[PDB]
Fold:
Amino acid sequence: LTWMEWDREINNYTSLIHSLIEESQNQQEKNEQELL
Amino acid sequence: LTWMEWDREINNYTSLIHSLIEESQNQQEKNEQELL
Amino acid sequence: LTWMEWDREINNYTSLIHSLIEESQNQQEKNEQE
Amino acid sequence: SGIVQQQNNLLRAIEAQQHLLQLTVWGIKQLQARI
Amino acid sequence: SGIVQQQNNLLRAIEAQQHLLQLTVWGIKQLQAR
Amino acid sequence: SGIVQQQNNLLRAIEAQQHLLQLTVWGIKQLQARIL
Structure:
């Protein structure tokens, strides 16, 4: 592993994280309207 | 962002999440009592 | 805390997280079928 | 109901822990550039 | 399905946070190693 | 109960992750005193 690769992996997984969370928000809000 | 701000932002988020976890713990305890 | 200890607590919490996640994988598979 | 609230709780906590992750990533880059 | 999917998302969120954790630990070790 | 019991798991990894996180903070504070 180098500091260059590490940067690339930090970026991608940060992106994945932003991605998954945004998607959990949509599902959350959805699961709630399904409940009210 | 400077180092001094970083320091205070760690404390804030450390506290911010300690409170969140404590709330999750409480709900987990209530969902488990309800489950049984 | 010392660096020697730090290295050990890292390992230990890292292994626990991995047991924890793999269990969630176990469970997640179960839940998706029932 | 309790399941849906814990999901919300879990998510908020994931978010707060993400923001702490960016701060630790920030500090690592700072230090690394400095050397 | 909405509840079960959310659980999958929460898990995947964790799994990826865990990879970010391992990377920062690497980063901290390299710095320490220097 | 499957759902409830798994939420116990994900809550538990959160917590362990939080503590791992607190460990990386410490490491970052030692490194900043030395460097700088």
Q: What stands out?
A: The radius of gyration of chain A is 16 Å. Chains A and C do not touch (no CB pair under 8 Å). Helices of chain A lie at 3-33.
